[PDB]
């Protein structure tokens, strides 16, 4: 049984038997015959193996030597097979089909020991027919005393064999006095139940007419459908229906744009109102270092005046901005080295927001504060659309004189599809490189790269970051442009949305008093005068400096550094147009797509009607659209695009005579106009959809 095995044997045999029973999927508390049988096999094998040694010469001594037998039984099957493979690779013998019990180093033999309750002869012939085809020695014991090995040959001494026979006979006699020897000779799937806690959990996860999990399970298994769906459809209200309202774009309204104050500029740098101090072929012994090029571009401008606040930031302290510019210009005048870190004055501390966060404590100290109110979470205040963002997008699609993107080289083109792709890519790059959107890509890449490097190296420093770009002329001469300066605050960025505050000070020739709603967060000074040479006359125009406090995140800087995917996406759009053409015309339609020297594509809306342009204008407009998607990225733009895509596809389904229909069009209009709150670019996209809707309405009478 169970208690006799623990009252009888050594703890080593019991530990080996418990390891084998836990490995094979048994237990001593459930089986008494199999546990005692495994203990009997282990005890016979251990008495077979122990007290046998091989000396330094080679003769078997029975009592600093080595053992004679290596035990393979009782070891785990991976451990035992490791021993078997190591022995079989030490000698030349092939592996047995199954695991033996012992290995004899002297005879070099795999010993198998089988102890049964029946006669020696029948169990021996069973194990001889089973272990057949290999040179595995067999040795069968029993409780009767007799033995029968392989061809009645025995490698062991007679004293040890008689000792194991005496141990087995004494074990049989102890089982006979215990009365358990009678049920010993007669002894020769998956389960997954629920414990009562999970059974009471299962009895509460049913449909409400049931109270037992097995009752509901028998109901599900013995279920037959008898028109239950139609019986529930006849009993449901008729107000649950999907009525198909017919869609006609001539009858639908336009998007309801919001009202209020005008939308202000919120880009991190000036786009079309930015002027640049440029040097041509710079060789000023810094040559690449940002502050050296900043001083080399600052030296090319004479005409600095005493700065005066000419347009106030209405919610701030404008004298602080004046002192910030004076301190910055004086520190650039006296700087030493490659980097400039400003002294943290009080106006710079106000302009960078130092001290504005409340001191974060743990709640266990601050339970006794009375006025502990939650952070308020208000929606954005709505803003009206102004013409400046349309003017900005108009300027961003135009050509410059500078080459703004320098691409690295490829491998040579050998495949014909590589020649086709290089022709397509060179057409797009010739039409797109001298664009203003490529200059904005360069500005954003440089600003976000420099802000990230300064934020992650100089966290406790008020570091001056000059807005630098570089370009090539039509003659290949290098030009280095300076647009302004960024004074970085303290940047201990832990989250992805933690804001580093900075101050941007940008040069400009545009008077801020002509469009004063655009410059809401800015404090514009008048720092100089420039003799601007026009085509005939030479005028003296004032040079302003737009100063504002801005802020950015690690995620925003990360996406600003990856700004050439705008160039990837615009090329992807133009190439998908070419691919959808060539999938029907069945030839390389790249050359009748870029060599169209006529205007074929509607891209504008003058007061005289709708204006067309060439394919290079279209690729520059697609680049500018991707760039403005990258600059004014918001959740409003994402939601508006995802919701108005459906209305665009409905208008396309109308134009294809595919008879479009809707189910709740007012809900779709509310979902579109919910995402139009205060961002200038999403307001311009809403106005663009309204203009396209009016155009496709007037196209069909």
């Amino acid at each position: 049984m169970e208690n006799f095995v623990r009252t009888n044997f050594n703890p080593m045999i019991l530990e080996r038997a418990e390891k084998t029973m836990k490995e094979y999927g048994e237990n001593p508390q459930n089986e008494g015959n199999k546990f005692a049988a495994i203990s009997t096999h282990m005890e016979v094998c251990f008495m077979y193996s122990d007290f046998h040694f091989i000396d330094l010469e080679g003769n078997t001594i029975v009592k600093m030597l080595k053992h004679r037998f290596e035990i393979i039984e009782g070891q785990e099957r991976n451990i035992a097979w490791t021993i078997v493979n190591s022995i079989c690779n030490m000698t030349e013998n092939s592996k047995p089909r199954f695991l033996p019990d012992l290995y004899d180093y002297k005879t070099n033999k795999f010993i198998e020991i089988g102890v049964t309750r029946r006669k020696v002869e029948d169990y021996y012939y069973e194990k001889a027919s089973k272990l057949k085809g290999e040179n595995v020695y067999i040795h069968i014991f029993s409780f009767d005393g007799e033995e029968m090995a392989t061809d009645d040959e025995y490698i062991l001494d007679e004293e040890s064999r008689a000792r194991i026979k005496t141990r087995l006979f004494v074990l049989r006699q102890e089982l006979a006095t215990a009365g358990l020897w009678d049920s010993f000779r007669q002894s020769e799937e998956e389960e997954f139940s629920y414990p009562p806690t999970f059974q009471r959990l299962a009895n509460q996860s049913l449909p409400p007419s049931f109270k037992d999990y097995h009752q509901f399970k028998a109901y599900v298994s013995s279920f037959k459908a008898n028109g239950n769906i139609e019986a529930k459809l006849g009993a449901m209200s008729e107000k649950v229906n999907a009525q198909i309202e017919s869609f006609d774009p001539r009858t639908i309204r336009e998007l309801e744009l919001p009202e209020g104050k005008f939308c202000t500029q919120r880009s991190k740098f000036l786009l079309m109102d930015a002027m640049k101090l440029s040097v041509l072929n710079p060789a000023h012994e810094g040559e690449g270092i940002p502050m050296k090029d900043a001083k080399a571009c600052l030296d090319t401008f004479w005409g600095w005046k005493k700065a005066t606040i000419i347009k106030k930031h209405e919610k701030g302290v404008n004298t602080n901005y004046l002192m910030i510019w004076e301190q910055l210009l004086e520190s650039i005048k006296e700087m030493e080295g490659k980097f400039l870190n400003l002294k943290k004055t009080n106006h710079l501390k106000w302009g960078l927001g130092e001290g504005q966060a409340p001191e974060k404590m743990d709640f266990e100290d601050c339970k006794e504060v009375p006025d502990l109110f939650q952070y308020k979470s208000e929606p954005p205040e709505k803003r009206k659309l102004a013409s400046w963002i349309q003017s900005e997008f108009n300027k961003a699609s135009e050509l410059t004189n500078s080459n703004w993107i320098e691409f690295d080289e490829l491998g040579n083109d050998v495949a014909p599809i590589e020649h086709i792709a290089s022709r397509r890519r060179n057409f797009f790059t010739a039409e797109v490189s001298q664009c203003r959107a490529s200059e904005y890509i360069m500005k954003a890449v440089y600003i976000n790269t420099a802000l990230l490097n300064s934020s992650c190296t100089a966290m406790e420093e008020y570091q001056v970051i000059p807005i630098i770009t570089k370009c090539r002329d039509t003659s290949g001469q290098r030009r280095t442009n300076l647009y302004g300066f960024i004074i970085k605050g303290r940047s201990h960025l832990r989250n992805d949305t933690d804001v580093v505050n900075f101050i941007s000070l940008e040069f400009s020739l545009t008077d801020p008093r002509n469009e004063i709603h655009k410059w809401e967060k800015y404090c514009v000074l008048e720092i100089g005068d420039m003799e601007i040479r026009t085509s005939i006359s030479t005028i003296m125009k004032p040079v302003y400096l737009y100063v504002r406090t801005n802020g950015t995140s690690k995620i925003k800087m990360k996406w600003g550094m990856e700004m050439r995917r705008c160039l990837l996406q615009s090329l992807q759009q133009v190439e998908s147009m070419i691919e959808a053409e060539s999938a029907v015309k069945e030839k390389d339609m790249t050359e009748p797509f870029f060599r169209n020297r006529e205007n074929d594509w509607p891209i504008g809306e003058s007061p005289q009607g709708i204006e067309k342009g060439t394919i290079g204008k279209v690729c520059r407009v697609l680049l500018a659209k991707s760039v403005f998607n990258s600059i004014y990225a918001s959740a409003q733009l994402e939601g508006f695009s995802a919701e108005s895509r459906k209305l665009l596809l409905l208008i396309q389904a109308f134009r294809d005579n595919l008879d479009p229909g809707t189910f709740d069009l007012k809900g779709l209009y509310e979902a579109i106009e919910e995402c139009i709150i205060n961002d200038p670019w999403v307001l311009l996209n809403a106005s663009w959809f309204n203009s396209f809707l009016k155009a496709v309405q007037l196209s069909m009478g």
Binding site: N78, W81, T82, N85, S86, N89, K95, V414, A415, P416, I417, I420, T449, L452, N453, S455, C456, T457, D496, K554, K558, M561, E579, A580, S582, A583, K585, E586, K587, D588, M589
Partner: protein
């Protein structure tokens, strides 16, 4: 030869926590605690490399690099510094040290470097001696088929070449599996006859024989040839609306 590792195991068993972990965790449970990572992860590794390469010493190397390269370059660049009171087997290293090693390091023999990566050199030989045809633009209808991204060896399936590899380089850990094919013993004998004079780790020649012998199939959208020498150039031979006719070398 067997004594230092058992003395290291004895010094680990003298620690109580290592002894409890070694005695309680099994050989099948040490595939779970092999990936036990506890600490603050990084969400932007690309941005981390961006701002870490701008620092002076982004590379983490061993202590032997204290005696293999100098401290200072020829141009005055400090190739390596120490850590803050860490005399361990790890220092900090600038990539100027890597450029130093590539321009003024010790030249060796690299005769085993082609034969480990013979699959990639075979791909380069098929691409260099391939002949392209005219592109044909039409509506490409690619069907998802189970195709052979690695042809492997003949007379060896995917569950049998792995047993050949387990026989060749890790012979005392094959378990109960035997060699049940006449080609298996010949391939095993040849691969053991090759890989004897080699100071390369057995995992690397195991992956070498894996990319030489173990066949790999994968579902891929193909409209054309489904051979193994055409699966690898699927990016080059077809697209959405075209087809690059190609004949590989051989």
């Amino acid at each position: 030869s067997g004594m230092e590792r058992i003395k290291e195991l004895m010094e680990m068993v003298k620690n109580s926590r290592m002894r409890e972990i070694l005695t309680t965790t099994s050989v099948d449970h040490m595939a779970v605690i092999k990936k036990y990572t506890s600490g603050r992860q990084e969400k932007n590794p690309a941005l981390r490399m961006k701002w870490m390469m701008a620092m002076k010493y982004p590379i983490s190397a061993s202590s032997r690099i204290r005696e293999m390269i100098p401290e200072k370059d020829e141009d005055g660049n400090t190739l390596w510094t120490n850590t803050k009171d860490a005399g361990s087997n790890r220092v900090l290293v600038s990539p100027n040290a890597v450029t130093w090693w590539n321009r003024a390091g010790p030249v060796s023999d690299v005769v085993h470097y082609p034969r480990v990566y013979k699959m990639y050199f075979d791909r380069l030989e098929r691409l260099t001696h391939g002949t392209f045809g005219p592109v044909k633009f039409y509506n490409q209808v690619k069907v998802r088929k189970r195709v052979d991204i690695n042809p492997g060896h003949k007379d060896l399936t995917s569950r049998e070449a792995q047993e050949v590899i387990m026989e060749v380089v890790f012979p005392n850990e094959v378990g109960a599996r035997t060699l049940s094919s006449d080609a298996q013993l010949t391939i095993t004998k040849e691969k053991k006859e090759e890989l004897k004079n080699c100071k390369i780790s057995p995992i690397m020649v195991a992956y070498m024989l894996e990319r030489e012998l173990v066949r790999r199939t994968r579902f891929l959208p193909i409209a054309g040839a489904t051979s193994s020498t055409y699966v690898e150039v699927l990016h080059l031979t077809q697209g959405t609306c075209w087809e690059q006719q190609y004949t590989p070398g051989g």
